[PDB]
């Protein structure tokens, strides 16, 4: 039956600061996986070259472009953050591949999401390893007649999907191997910067169900147990 | 620094092989991304039996992402097999496997029973005029420009698991003639009560339309085994 090949395959991409899974239908990442360590955050502002590039290893039919974003009113929000990888120039520049980028409401990118990223980095002082998994969500809302719909904008000629929400899963690895799970969801909206990050914790099961992804079985295969944080 | 993928890679491609088809599955929509069949003429059994299994949830999909009959029940949508049951009358198992809900998408009943069924019949009918008829079928989620000027993707989700309701469906027939040359017909119908009397040809679309919108690639793989396809 596969005489003429399979119409689509798993699109994994390994970069020097992350690995990701790419969804060609959304023209966006499904999840991005980083590993934070305290020494990987130390660095200077030496070269400061920061231009988002389009991912040439994604077919043109399904590759977001800078044009898709300009004039959209949406910031180019890097899922794997540049500041996570100061120690290496290449690790920083790879976060500027648009394959690592999703349309974010500017206020969110600059304030509440950015504060979530700095919290994640701040945890690198108290844990020997901070694994970070970031990605989009397209959450349905129930109308008053009982019917539910997924609705999200697409921007640019390439119809790049604007997520309704974003998730960030933190696998906090202490020195002794104990592991702490913190799962955050924020709407793709102007989130009040003064609400504490604790309020955005959600059970990891709700992210797994809504994302089509699975975390807890792969964690708790090598963790044995895990402390599920729900502030 | 240890290694990046120490915990799991959260997403894995999900290919399923059945005796009647190959499919790849998308857990977010709780539906298939595409289904690939090969219709061959004696693979339609003119003299045979009629054993229709029940629709069954695919237990090889994690329950977080598995469509159930409860999800369709009361939705008002038919359980539309992407790989049609009538395509595999040769074997009882090859047809039983089309009733795995991983092969199923919510279809407007009128579409599934009248216009999309006729398209399935028409594709079976070209098994008489071609060596092999390869059929790839899948959902589409097409955006619309609204009154504010911005384009939006909007679709219903049904049942407790929020199974995605495609806005459109596509079907791509790879027609392999005797001279081994391949003609390509690709159709698109809206998930809607399509007028039965409209000629199927009017639903033909350029394959690039499908590839662009579905996120899939067909032409490069055809030229990878053939050398040249013909018109749209």
Q: Is residue B8 part of a domain?
A: no
B211 closest CA partner among B199, B221, B202, B203: B221
Task: Judge whether B22 and B35 are in contact, CB under 8 Å.
Answer: yes
Q: What is the resolution of this structure in A?
A: 2.3
Q: Is residue B9 part of a domain?
A: no
Q: How many residues does chain B have?
A: 232
> How many C-beta neighbours within 10 Å does residue B188 have?
18
Q: Is residue B7 part of a domain?
A: no
Task: Judge whether A180 and A226 are in contact, CB under 8 Å.
Answer: yes
Q: Is residue A4 part of a domain?
A: no
Q: Which helix (H) or strand (E) holds B206?
A: none
Cα dihedral value A212, A217, A218, A221, nearest 10? 180
Residue of A nearest to B175 (CA): A4
CATH code assigned at B218 = 3.40.570.10
Q: Which of B2, B38, B174 sits opposite A129 (nearest CB)?
A: B2
Q: Which of A149, A154, A215 sits opposite B151 (nearest CB)?
A: A154
- How far is CA A230 from each of CA A180, B22, B169, rounded to the nearest angstrom? 11, 41, 41
Q: Which of A35, A59, A154 sits opposite B4 (nearest CB)?
A: A35
Q: Which residues of A touch B7 (CB under 8 A)?
A: 131, 171, 215, 218-219, 222-223
Q: Is residue A3 part of a domain?
A: no
| Whole-number Å distance between alpha carbons of A149 and B164 | 9
CB pair distance less than 8 Å for A6 and B26:
no
Q: Which residues of B touch A59 (CB under 8 A)?
A: 217
What are the structure tokens assigned to A101, written together? Answer: 């980028």
Q: Which residues of B touch A124 (CB under 8 A)?
A: none
> How many C-beta neighbours within 10 Å does residue A125 have?
9
Q: Is residue A178 part of a domain?
A: yes
What are the structure tokens assigned to A213, written together? Answer: 């992804």
- Split into its structural domains, chain A has a count of 1
Q: Is residue B111 part of a domain?
A: yes
Q: Which residues of A touch B9 (CB under 8 A)?
A: 12, 19, 21, 33, 218
What is the residue range of A43's domain? 12-228
What are the structure tokens assigned to A9, written together? Answer: 């395959």
Q: Is residue B190 part of a domain?
A: yes
H-helix segments, chain B:
69-72, 92-96, 109-110, 116-125, 207-214, 219-225
B94 closest CA partner among B159, B7, B164, B17: B17
CB pair distance less than 8 Å for A2 and B24:
no
> How many C-beta neighbours within 10 Å does residue A175 have?
9
| Whole-number Å distance between alpha carbons of B29 and B161 | 10
């Amino acid at each position: 039956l596969a005489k003429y090949g399979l119409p689509g395959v798993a699109q994994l991409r390994s970069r020097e600061s992350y690995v990701l899974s790419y969804d060609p239908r959304t023209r966006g990442a499904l999840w991005v996986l980083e590993q934070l360590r305290p020494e990987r955050l130390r660095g200077d502002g030496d070269r400061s070259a920061a231009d988002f590039r389009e991912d040439d290893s994604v077919h043109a039919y399904h590759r977001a472009t800078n044009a898709d974003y300009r004039g959209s009113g949406f910031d180019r929000g890097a899922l794997a953050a540049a500041a996570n990888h100061r120690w290496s120039q290449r690790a920083m520049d790879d976060t500027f591949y648009l394959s690592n980028v999703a349309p974010q409401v500017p206020h969110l990118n600059q304030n509440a999401w950015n504060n979530l990223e700095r919290y994640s980095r701040s945890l690198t002082r108290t844990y020997q390893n901070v694994y970070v998994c970031t990605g989009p969500l397209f959450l349905p809302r129930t109308e008053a007649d009982g019917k539910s719909y997924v609705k999200y904008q697409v921007i640019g000629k390439n119809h790049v999907a604007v997520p309704t929400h974003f998730f960030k899963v933190l696998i906090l690895e202490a020195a002794g191997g104990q592991i702490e799970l913190r799962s955050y969801v924020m709407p793709n909206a102007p989130v009040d910067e003064t609400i504490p990050l604790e309020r955005f914790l959600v059970p990891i099961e709700s992210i797994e169900r809504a994302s089509g992804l699975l975390f807890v079985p792969n964690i708790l295969a090598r963790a044995g147990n895990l402390k599920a944080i729900t502030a």
